[PDB]
Amino acid sequence: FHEMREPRIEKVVVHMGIGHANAEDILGEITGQMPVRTKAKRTVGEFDIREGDPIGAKVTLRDEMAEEFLQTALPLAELATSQFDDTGNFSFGLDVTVNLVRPGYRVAKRDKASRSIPTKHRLNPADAVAFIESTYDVEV
Amino acid sequence: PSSNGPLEGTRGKLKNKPRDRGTSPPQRAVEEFDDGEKVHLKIDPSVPNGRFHPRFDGQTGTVEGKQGDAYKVDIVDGGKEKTIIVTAAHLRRQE
Amino acid sequence: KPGAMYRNSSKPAYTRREYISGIPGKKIAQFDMGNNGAGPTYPAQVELVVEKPVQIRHNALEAARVAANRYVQNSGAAANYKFRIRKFPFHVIRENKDGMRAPFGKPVGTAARVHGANHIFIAWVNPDPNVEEAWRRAKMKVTPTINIDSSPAGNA
Amino acid sequence: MHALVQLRGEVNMHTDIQDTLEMLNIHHVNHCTLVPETDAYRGMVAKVNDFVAFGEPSQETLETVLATRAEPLEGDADVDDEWVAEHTDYDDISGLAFALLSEETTLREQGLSPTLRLHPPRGGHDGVKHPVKEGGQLGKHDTEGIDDLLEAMR
Amino acid sequence: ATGPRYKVPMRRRREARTDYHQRLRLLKSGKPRLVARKSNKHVRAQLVTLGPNGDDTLASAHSSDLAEYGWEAPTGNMPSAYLTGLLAGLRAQEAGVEEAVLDIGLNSPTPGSKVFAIQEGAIDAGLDIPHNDDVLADWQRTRGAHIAEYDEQLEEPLYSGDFDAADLPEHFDELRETLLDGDIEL
RNA sequence: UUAGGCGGCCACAGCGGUGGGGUUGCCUCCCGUACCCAUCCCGAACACGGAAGAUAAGCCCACCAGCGUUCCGGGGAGUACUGGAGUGCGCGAGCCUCUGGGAAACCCGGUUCGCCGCCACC
RNA sequence: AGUGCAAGAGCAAAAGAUAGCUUGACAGUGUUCUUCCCAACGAGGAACGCUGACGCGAAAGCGUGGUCUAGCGAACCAAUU
RNA sequence: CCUGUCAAACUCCAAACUUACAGACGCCGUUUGACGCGGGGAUUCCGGUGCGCGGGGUA
Ligand SMILES: [Cl-]
Ligand SMILES: [Cl-]
Ligand SMILES: [Mg+2]
Ligand SMILES: [Mg+2]
Ligand SMILES: [Mg+2]
Ligand SMILES: [Mg+2]
Ligand SMILES: [Mg+2]
Ligand SMILES: [Mg+2]
Ligand SMILES: [Mg+2]
Ligand SMILES: [Mg+2]
Ligand SMILES: [Mg+2]
Ligand code: NA
Ligand code: NA
Ligand code: NA
Ligand code: NA
Ligand code: NA
Ligand code: NA
């Protein structure tokens, strides 16, 4: 049963929601791989009327690239609880989000016969706290 | 009528019931008919091409040759003889 | 203007406010009268039944209702009874006020279409039918002949 | 098998109703025809229901009327037993009558005019403004009802 | 689901198995379809025709029944695909089928992919199919050379037990060679 | 069909939920990036290569009706409406009778948790 | 939601969005329907072909302008190929 | 949750009925030639009423 039920880290998105950049540079070093532009939608008063327009960058890290990052990110954060997803995720911070899920997630991300993950096989906030808390730190 | 375009007074006949909404199955768009076969004409709201003038919706003609992938169906409008260019997507075998 | 001009249901239903503007407000003050705080927990229930399909201008509704409830003060301003007028004047009415040229009239009021046998008014009372009298005065100010019907009440 | 009698004239009667009567071989008031009870014929009589009188006649009545008002496809000749025997499959009016009623043959099949040109009803009929159930003479009749009319028009 | 007005997609669209827009375009040719499908471990190739109550498969080949002819290697690779293509192509010919169009289902038209290998195979089997040569692998990769070289960077057998240690694109030739004459079910 | 591929009808198949299933064989998740190929950044996906592990997802099998849907019984209802006829009634609006058709809402009880085709396969 | 603009209709692995590429908004000639139900009548419009030349795509295929129904003009004379 | 009402430019529903084609019966046509084709000659393009269904209008 377990082993295929035990949580794991799938991507950590580090993005800097600026309002118009030079910031990529630091993201590249803090993570270790190229950042991506962040176009925006809708025309708005913050002199942000331009539809297609660089307004920040993000970086999606997977596998070691994600751990090796969290092995310094997490320490710079304290928070926990309430600040967690209903799906077992959590964002802290410049933003750093951690998407968590169990072994058979590809089923919902592949092209052929894809499907949504059953609520039972989903990751709960609690089952999430455990996994991470059980990895160099404390909850609440 | 306040206007005289082809679609005048076609709100009903060219609209789908909410559940039959969306792209239609390909099977009937590929159906093949032989010259002489009787076919009922009925536009499929979901299928843009291969259409005929809404006034013929409900007619039952006789396939008589085709043009490209489109069929040529002979019908009789009132007392006049007419040939309609129509695709399988808008035809059905009688009986 | 006379009821004769609008009391018949011979015109198409004309109620689409999305295509009609300048409709006059309704003169009907309230639809729920009496102790609306309480629910129909009364022994007796009398109803005023219209006997012919007709149109009833909000004019008549107001005068009919007032004359009935205004009288139901034989029981007191805070008496124990609840009065209800279940119809609302949906049908918009016009008047062609040029002669018969471009005659589609302009909105001049509203009327409610009642079919013969429907109850336009329903009152709830304890064995104390002063209400039967409140209606003799009500159907006095509406076009049709009417039937005063009692439902829960075998206390005759 | 039902006996059809046109009781109302053509003036003002729907065309599609008149044609129907015409398809049933009746082209004048008081003219009568015999019609099988089939789906196709049933629809026809129902459409004509308001300008006619119909019902299943008794063996006797039919015989009376056949004897009195039957005719050859052409000519004056009286259709009596002898005629019937020397011209039809049957041996006498009764035999023909039975065959019509049991819908085994038809007036044409036996060289007879599809139409029994009846006489006005002696004593007058019940009215052509109300159906039977209302005291008139229109619509489906009783076998006893049809017989009276047929007999009065013998 | 939600109400009377709710629109439920076709079963094969819910299952995310059939792309109906592509299907129609495919059926336009009026020719049989060369259904090229894959599995983590195998590769299937069918020649389907249109029918009154559904498709009719007139000829097929599965990477599994490849061994039935002397295959002693994995079956979820390039050389496997090609041969299964050729195998289904031959059975296809036998069935009287002369032409078809390539249906790759929900797979991607990546150059040198296994579905195109399947297409190459079926073509060489004699089947006439609308194609484009420079979207196909360069023969060597089809033979399984890319895998042999990959085992050159050995240190540990690429194949757990299986057959050979340095693998065999030669075993590939032996098989194609075999399928190109006589033998049962062909 | 002890798990498969391509479909037809396109909710009777949707939504939600329970239970069961892989010892060699199938589908998966799964493991992994030298290659073909790939991410406006990530072998996530796509693509390729592969079996150390698992049946927890998916998937297949058996089942539940609470919601949505399909059909049926009984009731609503031969009601509402209506094709044909009337020197029937009504100041009129309109109604009635005869004849030929015939509903919707809703309630109560069943049904429905897909059916079928072709191919492949201990 | 979006799809340029009325109103009604079509559309979800798209007819919408993004990116890239491209100029089929191509030349020639027809069939049919419409304009004008039935039922004669022009310009215009549309659907569907063919011939030729191209664009894209692995390919089937798609492109005879914009998802569909409005956005149009005779003879005489001029200018233009 | 409970409770009170509507729609010519609303529709989860839904008639009667109208209508395309086909078969059956009927009726009709093959010396009264129908269905149809070609041609000659018109008149006509102020209409009205009843009933059913309407739209406008106090009527
Ligand atoms: Cl047309
Ligand atoms: Cl596949
Ligand atoms: Mg309509
Ligand atoms: Mg004679
Ligand atoms: Mg006398
Ligand atoms: Mg009399
Ligand atoms: Mg399980
Ligand atoms: Mg277009
Ligand atoms: Mg001039
Ligand atoms: Mg010029
Ligand atoms: Mg009509
Ligand atoms: Na559709
Ligand atoms: Na004026
Ligand atoms: Na009165
Ligand atoms: Na960019
Ligand atoms: Na499982
Ligand atoms: Na034209």
Side-chain angles (χ1 to χ4, degrees):
Chain A
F1 69 98
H2 76 302
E3 189 184 60
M4 299 301 262
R5 273 271 307 186
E6 56 183 62
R8 80 179 183 193
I9 288 180
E10 185 201 61
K11 84 177 179 177
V12 183
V13 182
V14 306
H15 132 284
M16 297 189 276
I18 312 178
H20 38 65
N22 57 308
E24 286 179 56
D25 313 301
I26 60 181
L27 272 179
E29 305 172 304
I30 186 183
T31 58
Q33 72 184 191
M34 293 187 60
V36 142
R37 303 289 174 167
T38 292
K39 299 177 180 175
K41 294 186 172 181
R42 296 187 189 183
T43 283
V44 178
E46 38 181 287
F47 207 171
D48 183 40
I49 62 179
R50 181 170 172 165
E51 176 148 304
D53 51 358
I55 304 184
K58 79 179 175 183
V59 188
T60 54
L61 302 165
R62 291 178 150 75
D63 283 293
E64 301 184 303
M65 299 290 266
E67 296 185 302
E68 297 190 305
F69 175 84
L70 282 176
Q71 296 187 65
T72 39
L74 299 179
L76 307 182
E78 335 163 299
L79 289 173
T81 35
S82 81
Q83 177 190 44
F84 272 75
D85 227 71
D86 312 59
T87 317
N89 302 161
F90 73 102
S91 179
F92 63 96
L94 173 155
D95 306 300
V96 174
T97 343
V98 182
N99 198 190
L100 306 171
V101 73
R102 26 196 58 150
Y105 197 61
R106 167 191 170 66
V107 172
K109 294 300 179 182
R110 48 167 177 178
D111 286 353
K112 324 178 190 174
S114 74
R115 202 113 341 178
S116 185
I117 297 307
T119 58
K120 317 78 174 186
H121 197 64
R122 289 278 183 71
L123 189 57
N124 295 62
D127 302 304
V129 179
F131 172 69
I132 307 177
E133 181 179 59
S134 168
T135 311
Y136 297 59
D137 66 62
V138 175
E139 59 174 295
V140 181
Chain B
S2 52
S3 47
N4 202 58
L7 312 194
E8 165 285 303
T10 59
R11 191 227 258 294
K13 58 164 63 177
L14 303 186
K15 168 186 67 170
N16 269 153
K17 248 66 179 184
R19 271 183 58 172
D20 310 290
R21 188 245 299 180
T23 302
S24 299
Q27 187 78 335
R28 63 200 196 202
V30 186
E31 187 69 286
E32 293 280 305
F33 303 91
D34 303 306
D35 307 351
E37 286 194 60
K38 289 292 190 170
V39 298
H40 299 119
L41 284 65
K42 174 65 204 79
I43 299 182
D44 192 322
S46 302
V47 183
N49 312 305
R51 292 194 177 190
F52 51 76
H53 189 301
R55 268 187 190 141
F56 304 131
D57 238 36
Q59 278 292 320
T60 297
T62 304
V63 173
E64 295 282 46
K66 48 162 52 187
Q67 195 157 299
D69 294 321
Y71 286 89
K72 286 193 284 184
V73 182
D74 294 326
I75 56 153
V76 165
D77 190 354
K80 191 177 181 180
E81 226 165 302
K82 294 186 187 179
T83 296
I84 304 178
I85 301 301
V86 52
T87 65
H90 307 293
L91 300 180
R92 305 286 286 176
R93 279 204 182 60
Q94 176 171 50
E95 243 61 61
Chain C
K1 309 233 94 68
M5 288 164 70
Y6 311 99
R7 71 201 173 191
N8 296 143
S9 282
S10 65
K11 292 189 174 187
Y14 188 66
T15 70
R16 308 294 302 278
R17 319 225 162 194
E18 37 259 273
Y19 307 110
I20 307 168
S21 63
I23 304 164
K26 170 173 64 192
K27 298 175 186 169
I28 303 178
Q30 334 141 47
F31 283 69
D32 303 308
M33 296 160 271
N35 290 294
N36 51 64
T41 49
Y42 294 71
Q45 178 201 64
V46 192
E47 332 171 65
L48 189 62
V49 187
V50 155
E51 293 195 301
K52 304 183 293 174
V54 292
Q55 300 210 303
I56 294 185
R57 312 214 290 300
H58 71 303
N59 308 210
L61 285 329
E62 184 53 42
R65 199 226 62 203
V66 171
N69 194 228
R70 186 209 296 136
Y71 173 73
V72 93
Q73 267 51 304
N74 201 66
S75 298
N80 190 206
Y81 77 83
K82 42 197 300 70
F83 203 41
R84 295 188 323 192
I85 166 190
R86 36 227 311 179
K87 300 301 182 189
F88 289 74
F90 287 121
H91 204 56
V92 177
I93 44 196
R94 340 171 184 111
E95 173 173 37
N96 178 49
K97 56 211 303 181
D98 164 86
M100 273 312 292
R101 155 179 292 180
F104 192 79
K106 65 186 243 185
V108 296
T110 47
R113 282 185 169 170
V114 182
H115 268 75
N118 293 198
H119 32 271
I120 187 184
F121 282 118
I122 304 294
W124 282 280
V125 68
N126 312 294
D128 174 61
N130 267 296
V131 30
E132 238 164 52
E133 185 66 330
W135 287 341
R136 191 215 67 197
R137 301 196 173 187
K139 88 256 208 188
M140 203 71 255
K141 297 183 176 176
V142 286
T143 303
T145 291
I146 292 179
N147 188 318
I148 286 188
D149 191 311
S150 175
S151 314
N155 312 179
Chain D
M1 184 276 265
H2 289 139
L4 246 203
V5 182
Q6 170 167 25
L7 292 179
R8 294 182 66 192
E10 52 155 22
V11 188
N12 293 318
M13 80 171 262
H14 285 304
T15 301
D16 66 346
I17 294 191
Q18 208 179 312
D19 292 333
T20 298
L21 285 188
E22 279 178 24
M23 291 178 194
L24 298 189
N25 303 296
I26 90 180
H27 301 78
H28 302 271
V29 171
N30 292 342
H31 276 200
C32 165
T33 187
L34 313 176
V35 38
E37 291 185 47
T38 312
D39 291 318
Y41 273 111
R42 199 161 111 254
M44 300 199 266
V45 317
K47 185 174 188 59
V48 157
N49 178 288
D50 306 293
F51 309 79
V52 90
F54 71 92
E56 173 171 45
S58 67
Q59 179 75 44
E60 313 203 332
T61 298
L62 185 51
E63 272 169 39
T64 302
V65 169
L66 278 184
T68 193
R69 307 283 169 178
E71 294 184 309
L73 240 43
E74 282 175 45
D76 267 312
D78 292 7
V79 183
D80 49 40
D81 288 305
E82 174 166 40
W83 192 94
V84 182
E86 307 196 304
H87 281 294
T88 319
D89 311 319
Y90 313 77
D91 318 316
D92 62 320
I93 295 181
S94 292
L96 180 41
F98 179 75
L100 290 175
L101 281 171
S102 59
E103 325 184 325
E104 203 63 62
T105 193
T106 60
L107 296 164
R108 291 194 170 193
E109 292 205 312
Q110 306 314 162
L112 290 183
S113 172
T115 318
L116 312 178
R117 306 191 293 86
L118 312 189
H119 176 102
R122 342 219 192 320
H125 57 216
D126 293 310
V128 285
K129 292 192 176 307
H130 302 285
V132 178
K133 290 186 169 184
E134 270 181 40
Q137 199 85 57
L138 313 168
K140 178 167 183 178
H141 291 218
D142 241 341
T143 288
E144 166 168 54
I146 255 303
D147 287 17
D148 292 313
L149 185 61
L150 290 178
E151 267 161 47
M153 295 200 278
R154 133 258 323 182
Chain E
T2 297
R5 197 170 188 159
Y6 192 82
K7 165 62 171 51
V8 176
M10 292 184 290
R11 203 196 74 235
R12 284 219 130 211
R13 174 66 197 87
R14 298 172 222 148
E15 311 185 339
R17 304 190 135 298
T18 303
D19 171 309
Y20 283 94
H21 270 277
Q22 183 187 61
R23 184 137 197 285
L24 181 49
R25 273 120 44 178
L26 244 12
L27 298 182
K28 296 268 187 162
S29 75
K31 294 178 182 179
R33 282 186 302 142
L34 172 60
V35 180
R37 294 304 150 73
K38 309 179 309 170
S39 187
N40 288 333
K41 290 189 171 186
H42 295 292
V43 139
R44 168 137 42 191
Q46 297 164 307
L47 271 208
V48 190
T49 206
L50 227 47
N53 314 304
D55 294 322
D56 292 314
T57 307
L58 292 59
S60 78
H62 190 292
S63 62
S64 70
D65 57 291
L66 202 57
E68 178 183 349
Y69 296 81
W71 199 240
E72 194 174 353
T75 51
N77 47 53
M78 288 288 282
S80 194
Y82 173 98
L83 304 167
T84 301
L86 172 60
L87 181 54
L90 300 172
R91 286 169 179 162
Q93 280 281 279
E94 269 308 301
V97 180
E98 299 209 85
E99 54 198 10
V101 188
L102 180 68
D103 179 335
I104 71 167
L106 301 171
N107 291 107
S108 300
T110 303
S113 293
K114 291 182 281 184
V115 291
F116 284 147
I118 296 188
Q119 171 181 57
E120 211 187 315
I123 296 168
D124 286 326
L127 239 39
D128 235 290
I129 307 169
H131 64 273
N132 190 299
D133 291 313
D134 50 57
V135 84
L136 312 182
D138 79 291
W139 197 219
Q140 286 307 297
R141 186 187 175 71
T142 307
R143 282 167 44 71
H146 63 303
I147 194 177
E149 285 192 304
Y150 182 40
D151 183 283
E152 235 63 294
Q153 310 172 58
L154 192 58
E155 178 183 298
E156 283 159 58
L158 178 56
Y159 286 9
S160 178
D162 287 68
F163 80 136
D164 71 48
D167 307 309
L168 302 171
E170 288 71 55
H171 188 174
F172 169 68
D173 306 295
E174 306 182 304
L175 198 57
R176 155 163 176 163
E177 166 72 301
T178 301
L179 300 169
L180 299 176
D181 59 296
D183 75 296
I184 307 300
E185 295 169 58
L186 277 185

